[PDB]
Amino acid sequence: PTIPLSRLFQNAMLRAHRLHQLAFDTYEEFEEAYIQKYSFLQAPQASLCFSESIPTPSNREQAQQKSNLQLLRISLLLIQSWLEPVGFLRSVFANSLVYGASDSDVYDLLKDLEEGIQTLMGRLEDGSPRTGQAFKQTYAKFDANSHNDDALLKNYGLLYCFRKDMDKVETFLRIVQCRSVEGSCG
Template sequence: EEAYISKEQKYSFLRNPQTSFCFSESIPTPSNREETQQKSNLELLRISLLLIQSWLEPVQFLRSVFTNKLVYGASNFNVYLYLTNLEEGIQTLMWRLDDGSPRTGQIFKQTYSKFDTNSHNDDTLLKNYWLLYCFRKDMNKVETFLRTVQCRTVEGSCGF
């Protein structure tokens, strides 16, 4: 990454208010630990599901942009497959916690037309870097919410 985007460029891009919006910010999520603790397990699972579903299409786009395995990942691990498996697992947990009736939340679809597959100029690389930044940020939220649910439901599993 450093070979393509200098630290100065990367951090100035992240601080730019015009570009610092991840689409998933339109999904209402707890913003701190106290708010997270106030949500029920079912609410945290629903939020996690929405975040995961919002990334199903963009991760396929990312894969096409970052065909270089050193940039995208060192393995053949398929992030899309991982997300769909996680989606299915969360839906199962929601079904068990709820009344047993399957529910699907509103799926947030985002058009990532502002992210360009032509990665030959610095602006395009920065925009695609921003997409990766948003993905990491959202997956950190999902991890936090799922750990909170696990901590509440599985005795002896609280490790944070």
């Protein structure tokens, strides 16, 4: 009955591109309405995002062979980290000039994806484990709030990184769904 397991990979996949899209909708307009990024903004605002993991597998290549179970553990930190904002922190940070209220404003697309992406490790746990983080560790990027004339380049960053630390929760979960089931991607 709603058991086909492939639908798990589905649910997360529909919502995770549904999720690259708002982070990059919001990214796109935001930079124009404020910043001339390479005027000299790049080196003095020196990286972060989850660019440091197995630094992005994405050009088309299926992430190089690795364990079906770390792209899901090495993923869930990338989502659970934004989840430290998306709990009380409102739109005054990421208020959607481009919106639809599609689904469930921004938390519960982010929240359902980590809830549903929980049910797939509990299902792969033992034969190939030793999953590199073990004991409690929080991952909270920074936090964001409000308008000034620097504050927003504090801000910019997360609205840029939710591009660059999302090309991985979905494309890199896309690998596990076009690596761990048959068809329907290619």
